[PDB]
Design a protein around this ligand. Structure first.
Ligand code: DDV
Length: 330
């Protein structure tokens, strides 16, 4: 089997991407944030505290003839930005782009934090990291990919995120028309539950490539590119007037600037992030100070190849017995 679904930016800055997902019988379609940095599939629901729902589409398990409460099961998660959600668990039928999993754990939110409430465009998350990170207690549950894997033509999924444009998530096959040149595969460590790999270095604009190992995670659920302070300083030093602002919470730059590209290494291959991918627009409406799309990971504990990096590539999440990651230009 295979599946193929279009993923769409939630706003003009590509702050996140949403992908339609069918849950239950009859289908209830929710727009979920596919997140390769977490392992819970959770949704706004009929159980979510009413004051914490503000325009999201909800899953109503009582209207699904295939929904079954998973007795005694609860979940609770918190993300890097300090947002969180929690609730109870159903199993139900879940389909993505024509690929169907029966008995998928669908984690129904009873509570969500303010950031989730305030984002009307995201109805929940679909985790695609390793199932060892799944938060369901007392019995940990499998991700959609882990449940689908054995049925797939090939045990893989691919992320092809667009810049200011729709893109695609494919399950079970590699669309050889969706990239240029070859896909370069690189080793993954699953020891922290992430698609964790080591980039071979970087360049800023037309500058010389610096060979240096950068361990980080391929994370579709993180908007920006978070890298070591040394690397980030080298990037922003090439932008006149750019500075790290403690008040704003990172590097900002004059909106009149032309940003240089940023290249990262995948083995001997190179992925080039165009400068405009690194522009996240005015810090507040009407400001001429713009927020940068490359930021320091110093306060995080891990480097994160988020959407700013991934959208510059066709990315293969290879879930073979020994997982690997593939990157191609496009
Ligand atoms: O990019 C943000 C995400 N924003 C959601 C998007 C709709 C706007 C969420 C999910 O994860 C964090 O908060 C990351 S920042 C991060 C920081 C430290 C560690 C990991 C990630």
């Amino acid at each position: 089997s295979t599946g193929s679904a279009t993923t769409t930016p939630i706003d003009s800055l590509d702050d996140a991407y949403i992908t339609p997902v069918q849950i239950g019988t009859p289908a209830q379609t929710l727009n979920l944030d596919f997140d390769t940095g977490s392992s819970d599939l959770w949704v706004f629901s009929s159980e979510t505290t009413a004051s914490e729902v503000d325009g999201q589409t909800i899953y109503t398990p009582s209207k699904s003839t295939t929904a079954k409460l998973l007795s005694g099961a609860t979940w609770s998660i918190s993300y890097g930005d300090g947002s969180s959600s929690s609730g109870d668990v159903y199993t139900d039928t879940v389909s993505v782009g024509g690929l169907t999993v029966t008995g998928q754990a669908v984690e129904s939110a009873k509570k969500v934090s303010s950031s989730f409430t305030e984002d009307s465009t995201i109805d929940g998350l679909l985790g695609l990291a390793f199932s060892t990170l799944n938060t369901v207690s007392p019995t940990q549950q499998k991700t959609f990919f882990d449940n689908a894997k054995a049925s797939l033509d090939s045990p893989v999924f691919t992320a092809d995120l667009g810049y200011h444009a729709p893109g695609t998530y494919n399950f079970g096959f590699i669309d050889t028309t969706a990239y240029t040149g070859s896909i370069t595969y690189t080793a993954v460590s699953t020891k922290q539950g992430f698609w964790e790999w080591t980039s071979t270095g970087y360049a800023v604009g037309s500058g010389t490539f610096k060979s240096t190992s950068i361990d980080g995670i391929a994370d579709t659920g993180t908007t920006l590119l978070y890298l070591p302070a040394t690397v980030v300083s080298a990037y922003w030093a090439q932008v006149s007037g750019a500075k790290s602002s403690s008040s704003v919470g990172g590097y900002v730059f004059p909106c009149s600037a032309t940003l240089p590209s940023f290249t990262f290494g995948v083995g001997s291959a190179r992925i080039v992030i165009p400068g405009d991918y690194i522009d996240f627009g005015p810090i507040s409406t009407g400001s001429s100070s713009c927020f940068g799309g490359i930021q320091s990971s110093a306060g995080i504990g891990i480097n994160i190849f988020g959407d700013v990096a991934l959208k510059a590539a066709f990315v293969v999440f290879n879930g073979a017995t020994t997982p690997t990651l593939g990157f191609a230009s496009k």
